Design an enzyme around this catalytic site. Structure first.
Site, PDB file in Angstrom:
ATOM      1  N   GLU A   9      -9.483 -13.611  -2.303  1.00 33.05           N
ATOM      2  CA  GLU A   9      -8.629 -14.077  -1.211  1.00 33.05           C
ATOM      3  C   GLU A   9      -9.276 -15.299  -0.586  1.00 33.05           C
ATOM      4  OE1 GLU A   9      -6.944 -11.312   1.697  1.00 33.05           O
ATOM      5  OE2 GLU A   9      -7.734 -12.528   3.315  1.00 33.05           O
ATOM      6  N   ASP A  20      -6.427 -14.590   8.316  1.00 26.74           N
ATOM      7  CA  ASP A  20      -5.226 -14.447   7.495  1.00 26.74           C
ATOM      8  C   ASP A  20      -4.121 -15.361   8.011  1.00 26.74           C
ATOM      9  OD1 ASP A  20      -6.567 -12.501   6.017  1.00 26.74           O
ATOM     10  OD2 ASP A  20      -5.392 -10.832   6.869  1.00 26.74           O
ATOM     11  N   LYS A  32     -14.533  -8.811  -0.045  1.00 34.76           N
ATOM     12  CA  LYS A  32     -14.560  -9.292   1.341  1.00 34.76           C
ATOM     13  C   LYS A  32     -15.993  -9.061   1.822  1.00 34.76           C
ATOM     14  CE  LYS A  32     -12.167  -9.137   5.807  1.00 34.76           C
ATOM     15  NZ  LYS A  32     -11.395  -8.229   6.805  1.00 34.76           N
ATOM     16  N   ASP A  86      -1.385 -12.985   1.346  1.00 28.51           N
ATOM     17  CA  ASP A  86      -1.897 -11.909   2.200  1.00 28.51           C
ATOM     18  C   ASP A  86      -2.178 -12.591   3.531  1.00 28.51           C
ATOM     19  OD1 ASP A  86      -2.981  -9.736   3.385  1.00 28.51           O
ATOM     20  OD2 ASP A  86      -4.620  -9.461   1.970  1.00 28.51           O
ATOM     21  N   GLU A 127     -10.728  -6.675  -4.928  1.00 27.90           N
ATOM     22  CA  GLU A 127     -10.554  -7.704  -3.901  1.00 27.90           C
ATOM     23  C   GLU A 127     -11.812  -7.694  -3.048  1.00 27.90           C
ATOM     24  OE1 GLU A 127      -7.092  -7.346  -1.577  1.00 27.90           O
ATOM     25  OE2 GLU A 127      -7.689  -8.947  -0.165  1.00 27.90           O
ATOM     26  N   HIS A 130       0.840  -1.189   0.000  1.00 24.18           N
ATOM     27  CA  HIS A 130       0.000   0.000   0.000  1.00 24.18           C
ATOM     28  C   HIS A 130       0.879   1.244   0.000  1.00 24.18           C
ATOM     29  CE1 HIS A 130      -2.379  -3.066   2.231  1.00 24.18           C
ATOM     30  NE2 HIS A 130      -3.423  -2.531   1.613  1.00 24.18           N
ATOM     31  N   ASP A 162       2.234   1.923   3.375  1.00 24.06           N
ATOM     32  CA  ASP A 162       3.251   1.023   3.921  1.00 24.06           C
ATOM     33  C   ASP A 162       4.642   1.533   3.596  1.00 24.06           C
ATOM     34  OD1 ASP A 162       1.239  -0.874   4.681  1.00 24.06           O
ATOM     35  OD2 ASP A 162       1.455  -1.852   2.708  1.00 24.06           O
ATOM     36  N   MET A 220       2.526  -5.798  -7.975  1.00 21.00           N
ATOM     37  CA  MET A 220       1.206  -5.301  -7.641  1.00 21.00           C
ATOM     38  C   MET A 220       1.360  -4.198  -6.620  1.00 21.00           C
ATOM     39  SD  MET A 220      -1.222  -5.436  -4.977  1.00 21.00           S
ATOM     40  CE  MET A 220      -1.374  -6.956  -4.076  1.00 21.00           C
ATOM     41  N   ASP A 242     -11.550 -12.312  10.069  1.00 19.89           N
ATOM     42  CA  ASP A 242     -10.566 -12.634   9.017  1.00 19.89           C
ATOM     43  C   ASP A 242      -9.265 -13.007   9.700  1.00 19.89           C
ATOM     44  OD1 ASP A 242      -9.466 -12.557   6.278  1.00 19.89           O
ATOM     45  OD2 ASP A 242      -8.902 -10.448   6.565  1.00 19.89           O
ATOM     46  N   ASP A 297      -4.908 -13.768  -3.706  1.00 17.94           N
ATOM     47  CA  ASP A 297      -4.354 -13.644  -2.369  1.00 17.94           C
ATOM     48  C   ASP A 297      -4.489 -14.995  -1.700  1.00 17.94           C
ATOM     49  OD1 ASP A 297      -3.797 -10.917  -2.590  1.00 17.94           O
ATOM     50  OD2 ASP A 297      -5.182 -10.323  -1.013  1.00 17.94           O
ATOM     51  N   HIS A 357     -11.454 -14.778   2.522  1.00 12.57           N
ATOM     52  CA  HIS A 357     -12.635 -13.913   2.445  1.00 12.57           C
ATOM     53  C   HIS A 357     -13.829 -14.658   1.909  1.00 12.57           C
ATOM     54  CE1 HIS A 357      -9.904 -10.075   2.344  1.00 12.57           C
ATOM     55  NE2 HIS A 357      -9.807 -10.783   3.462  1.00 12.57           N
TER      56      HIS A 357
END
Ligand SMILES: [Mg+2]
Ligand SMILES: [Mg+2]
Ligand SMILES: [Mg+2]
Ligand SMILES: [Mg+2]
Ligand SMILES: [Mg+2]
Ligand SMILES: [Mg+2]
Ligand SMILES: [Mg+2]
Ligand SMILES: [Mg+2]
Lengths: 385, 385, 385, 385
Positions: free
Chosen positions: B215, B255, B181, B285, B179, B52, B55, B86, B253, B243, B218
């Site tokens: 993902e 992950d 969710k 992810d 994406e 991102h 980030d 990406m 979630d 993902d 998700h």
């Protein structure tokens, strides 16, 4: 809160006719004659009935028995003024469909499934149906290697394309609606939600002939927000029909009477259907619980329509309340409806108030006032306003 | 089971960089410098990293600090040979996005969200990204009156259309992937599954520029079958990115590292991606649990890639096994791949073997042999073959 | 629908005080001083407040700062007439508790967790609390080998037994209530439902000192029927305290205001608490959504109490309605309350009307009349009666 | 991976005998004679069979037909060496049980339910069963006013107490096991999980006669961790019997063959049963999918036992691996097994290293090393070690 035929409430013959056989138990009620269901539903104020081919004509009937079943049924429609707005095919009960109809691995079953469907489309048109529903309840798998899903979607597209070619070549004024369900009776069912069915339709040869027939309880079996899914179907122009009932969360398909289950979701659903001017049938796909005798069946059916009319009144009072209209503006629902950038991309890129000079802390501090708005909605639902 | 950059394994900076702050607890790990994550991931055999905007460049940085953050990062990519396939925008952390970015009720926030996105698209292209992901994590509602979903979908379409006009007017070779969710952090999130996102894309002005970035965890938060959803995305030609991670059912979630959670679903997913020739990044992810120190972080990241390579070997042995190939024919997977009616509608209608003379009881009695096929798949997964 | 302190509505300092930090986002509201929350809640009509140790005394405070925090708080209780009926320990926020408090694998953490708890029990007694809640939010696991659950239950029993020995040796009039939750923040949490906590209590050395503190949304995160679970806790004599809020199904813990989420379940819960004469606090463990500013916080808190009082009125009208009393008899609720065989086993065995001469088809044909009863309940809830 | 009778694998007559009738479809397989199931299961290596009364003796049979059904069955047990370790009563199929058996609102049904149970207890003892299971599949409700749950629990306690008085007065060596299920076929079922059933047992007059019979798929229908629930039942000394099968998440009860569904949970379950020395039957309550013919039925049954033996081997290799034993110590599983405070309360209170001088930051920084441990478990499960 008295229904009349103008409210367009409809019921499947299989709903009030459900004998109460579940996976663990024998039937608790005798079979109803379709003619008696039509008469009793007309007395309760319904507008019409729907059917699977095998609800009306017992599987395996001769063409002569078939004509007699239809004649009796049509006489009860004439006697009552009841309409038949929708019909559908049973491609799930007979053992031959144990791996599906349109996506069965065996090619000869798939051909049979199509012929059985086409026969009932002709009958549907003769009875005046405008929507033909497909619920692919056996299309799916319990294990990963049993079904190549890309090939199955090719077969599903092939089947719907052939049905589209048939109705257009016959000059029929009928449209198709796909009814999604995520699971049960298969471990996973293909096209499991509203969204998957909408996406699939866009790959058909004549997409304008297909829409969706969402059911309250089925989207809730995936934990999804049913009024949101209906909003997306309306946005796409694809809400051709709807199945109304109730469900308590993620579990087996309960098909409770409408208004049971998630009551606030029922309120927001009615608000949306009425606001958006949905003009199709209000169809109840529900099962009177097998605890009930026939008096309980008709009380359950009446409750479906009663609860819709109560929620319709409460949603209309909510939207008409000046204090709610004020709260909607406090929450900037008006601003949601205005274009983000009708001035265009280049003007957005040159607009320093959109980024370089945007005060992010001042915007962040603004409360949305959603809790006050939601409590106004709660007070309206409960009649405390 | 040693990964190399040719396996195209990628990681978000936010994955190994997650400090372990959850809704009930403070961070358990210090922040990682993006340059150190790139170096450690290269040593483990990764192919590249994703990010991102926030980030890589701390929110609020001056243009001069921004250039220095990017320069250091690019030097670590040069030093390691790591790629950036990406990138994506953070439109969820800052309080200004508390009601969304592209579908915030406040118009000025929506304009800000678009400018913040466009700035990072330019940077993504400069670093060589081919896919730009959008996760609309704040687009949604906790209550029914807060969000008119038709207006919100108009705003969502407007935003993606403007992004499409921007990349085409700049001549950028980049595509967008949505994406989905279903929920968390909003009570319900708009476009909640693969299917809803696919359907939405078909209403955009230039649909060929948009695909999905599903993902694992998700779709499993809605109880859906993730390999089935990926098959539908491949069928539509829209699987632009994926993902990979793990999830134990319908809950928050998690992950988890890939291979944890639903292991058989991970096996069938790898089987499908490899069979279909998916050639995009294998992106993880995931969040190393906050129980772990930094040694546990890198062991968790290594486990992601290890589990993919083990499952790849087992899926390839399954498909290559003559006994499985025999079982696939016994279960008529070959017949699923053949057209139902390449002879056409009229020939189907004239074919008495499809209905009038079809022996429904003989077809019904044929077993599908799916349980034997599934146990062969289980034996392969477990190395018992 | 105006609350007064006699309604015994209480709030945690952490509820209206939640700053809005979620797993994906920074705080949207500034911290509230506990003294200001007490004052604002008193003005809304609350009866009292509850606290974790670390809500009232910032973690790490010196004994001198601790006394000053308590003095200010006690002065605000004196100024307002607000009570403190319950307190609890924070054994989840600090990183040292990342693998649990009472069941952490490290023994020194477990000892620390007990000392931290015992310190706050003394303070709770000094402020007049009658119930001390334990929510073991970090007691659990994300993976199967991390936690031997039999050993962990030994450690959990050891910790609660030591707390029981402490309060009895000090002569304190305080009882313990365990608050179950199935998951979040751990992948699975030990004692995940009402039932598991009730069963565990029966293996403690002094079971009469322990009960449960169930929360609406937590049992609904397992898809369970919350009024049924409360009925079992009342039946066992163990409902010492309750946490009231709202939840939309199986997902992350939403902690919506009470009355949101499953509205019909809220109605049946209030019916049961009032019918059974529950006399403990009506405590709200809820989070004002992070969309809201401080005006929205207080509107959300007021809504909790409003919705309880509306549902209390509707449940009382339902039970008092002669037509409902008639329907309850039609459905044989009176017969459910009578003993199956007060005549005893031998008389049952000799009673030919119980088996040899029992007419099973006549009994089977009797409808239960539950749908009519449920629609009467719906009409009452909606104010249509 | 060849089973023998020493592995104590058992099957219900209703499992391989399921004809494939589901809520949407007719039977796909003919009925099996109980004598042929016994013979075929013996050839596959099973140890024994279980039955409901109505599986073995068709409902309504005369005492003379009853004796003949039992004689034939006993001859097939003699011919094969098959045992009957468990039996149970069908109190769910016949319409008279539509509102329950032990908690039906009608008192005469409840009396009938008890007599029907007592008759089969006598037969169970005659065939050598040591465990008598009760699955209260109709005990519950679809709506809130239909069932006062406190009165229903009084009726449930009354029924089990009467059964306890009967077996003790006859001098029978048999114990009872309650089989929980959260829902299906009722909307919510009373005693919905392991925990609720354990708590209920502690209020019976002779608790030592009752335990639980948990089923993999039923706890997973509430999203709960099945090995954790079994650990709590073992801890309480109450695991009298277990039902093994597979389930894919929160949905209808699939009863897949054991090893399907959540494979990692199956691994951790087998690890626990074998570690703890569970010595009861390994019973499969599963349904061969209705896609299958009879060859698929027996392949599915064989797969149940195969998957248990594969997972038993992998769990034993995991626990025996020195590298895993090292990792268990790195993760402080040894410290979990040691008492928190065997030195006692007063010593804990005087121990300054437990609080005043405890270094909370040093303890917090210690990683738990759970991800490395879990990947070792994954490598063992997959045969990559
Ligand atoms: Mg349904
Ligand atoms: Mg339907
Ligand atoms: Mg995720
Ligand atoms: Mg992701
Ligand atoms: Mg909560
Ligand atoms: Mg709570
Ligand atoms: Mg089951
Ligand atoms: Mg069972």
């Amino acid at each position: 809160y008295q229904p009349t035929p103008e409210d367009r409430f409809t019921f499947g013959l299989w709903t009030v006719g459900w004998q109460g056989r579940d996976p663990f138990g024998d039937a608790t009620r005798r079979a109803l004659d379709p003619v008696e269901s039509v008469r009793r539903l007309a007395e309760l104020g319904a507008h019409g009935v729907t059917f699977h081919d095998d609800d009306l004509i017992p599987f395996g009937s001769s063409d002569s028995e078939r004509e007699e079943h239809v004649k009796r049924f049509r006489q009860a429609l004439d006697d009552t003024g009841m309409k038949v707005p929708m019909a559908t095919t049973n491609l799930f009960t007979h053992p031959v469909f144990k791996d599906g109809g349109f996506t069965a691995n065996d090619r000869d079953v798939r051909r049979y499934a199509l012929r059985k469907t086409i026969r009932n489309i002709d009958l549907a048109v003769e009875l005046g149906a405008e929507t033909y529903v497909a619920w692919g309840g056996r299309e799916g798998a319990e294990s990963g290697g049993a079904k190549d899903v890309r090939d199955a979607l090719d077969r599903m597209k092939e089947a719907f394309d052939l049905l589209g070619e048939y109705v257009t070549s016959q000059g029929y004024d009928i449209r198709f609606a796909i009814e999604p369900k995520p699971n049960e009776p298969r471990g996973d069912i293909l096209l499991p939600t509203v969204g998957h069915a909408l996406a699939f339709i866009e790959r058909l040869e004549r997409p304008e002939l297909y829409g969706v027939n969402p059911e309250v309880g089925h989207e809730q079996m995936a934990g999804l927000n049913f009024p949101h899914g209906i909003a997306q179907a309306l946005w796409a122009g694809k809400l051709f029909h709807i199945d109304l009932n109730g469900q308590n969360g993620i579990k087996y398909d309960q098909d409770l009477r409408f208004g049971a289950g998630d009551l606030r979701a029922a309120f927001w659903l009615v608000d949306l259907l009425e606001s958006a001017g949905y003009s199709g049938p209000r169809h109840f796909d529900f099962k009177p619980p097998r605890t009930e005798d026939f008096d309980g069946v008709w009380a359950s059916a009446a409750g479906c329509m009663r609860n819709y009319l109560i929620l319709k009144e409460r949603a209309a009072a909510f939207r008409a309340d000046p204090e709610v209209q004020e709260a909607l503006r406090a929450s900037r629902l008006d601003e949601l409806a205005r274009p983000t950038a009708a001035d265009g991309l280049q003007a957005l890129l040159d607009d320093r108030s959109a980024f370089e000079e945007f005060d992010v802390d001042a915007a962040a501090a603004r409360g949305m006032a959603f809790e006050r708005l939601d409590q106004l909605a709660m007070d309206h639902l409960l009649g405390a306003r």
